[PDB]
């Protein structure tokens, strides 16, 4: 596999706070058709990485979501958070703006002054992101079936209907969520899914921001996400098991999954 980046993932190595990789940072100096953007990157992957963008719900900004940047990029792999050009972007809109902000890490990959120069698989691209961010996520993924995974988390469109996804899709959903009820909005848009590995991982007593920055199952949250971008995006097999498995968690309220390998 000419993806496989670090050692042998282990349980603890993928609940830990920080994977193998040292990660560094950069603001985005002219972003390209989105409001704002940081870009996390591993130092000593030892090669190409994949690219992935993340997008907050309305209101929020970058702070949201920020702690998946670190967590991703320190297992292999180039993450940009975004502030979207209004704080009340709509997802159809965030949609656009998330794919903009992919194209300007690969943008940044092919510019000699990044510190992302080389650094990049333009070929090899994920989606995440929380609410109307979480709706974009699969909008994106709709619209651009070559992209590689989709993770959203507590997702949210005035559509339910994503059968159009062949994207793998890992959906996180938070119990007690009263913004985007689970049972109007998460899993209606999972049980959609008929031509797609997916899954649905539904945290115990969780509120809306229960996939946020701060929130307190980062190791849970943490491992599943990785290993889903890892198993679809580097097609890891070495992750297929933390990927696919039902974590057997007093965390998790609810554990579905399809297709998965």
Not at 114 to 129: E, L
Request: one cysteine or more; glycine letters at 10%; a positive charge.
């Amino acid at each position: 596999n000419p993806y496989a980046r670090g050692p042998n993932p282990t349980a603890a190595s993928l609940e830990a706070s920080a994977g193998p990789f040292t990660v560094r940072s950069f603001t985005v100096s002219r972003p390209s058709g989105y409001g704002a953007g940081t870009v996390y990157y591993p130092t000593n992957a030892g090669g190409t990485v994949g690219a992935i963008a993340i997008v907050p719900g309305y209101t929020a900004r970058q702070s949201s979501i920020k702690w998946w940047g670190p967590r991703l990029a320190s297992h292999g792999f180039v993450v940009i958070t975004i502030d979207t050009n209004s704080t009340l972007d709509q997802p159809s809109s965030r949609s656009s703006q998330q794919m903009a902000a992919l194209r300007q890490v690969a943008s940044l990959n092919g510019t000699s002054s990044s510190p992302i120069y080389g650094k990049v698989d333009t070929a090899r691209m994920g989606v995440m992101g929380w609410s109307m961010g979480g709706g974009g996520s699969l909008i994106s993924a709709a619209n651009n079936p070559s992209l590689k995974a989709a993770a959203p988390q507590a997702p949210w469109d005035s559509s339910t209907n994503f059968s159009s996804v062949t994207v793998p899709t890992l959906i996180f959903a938070c119990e007690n969520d009263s913004i985007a009820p689970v049972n109007s909005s998460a899993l209606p848009i999972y049980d959609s899914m008929s031509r797609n590995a997916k899954q649905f991982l539904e945290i115990a007593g969780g509120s809306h921001s229960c996939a946020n920055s701060g929130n307190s199952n980062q190791a849970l949250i943490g491992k599943k996400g990785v290993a889903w971008m890892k198993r679809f995006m580097d097609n890891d097999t070495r992750y297929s098991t933390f990927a696919c498995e039902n974590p057997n968690s007093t965390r998790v309220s609810d554990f579905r999954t399809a297709n998965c390998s």
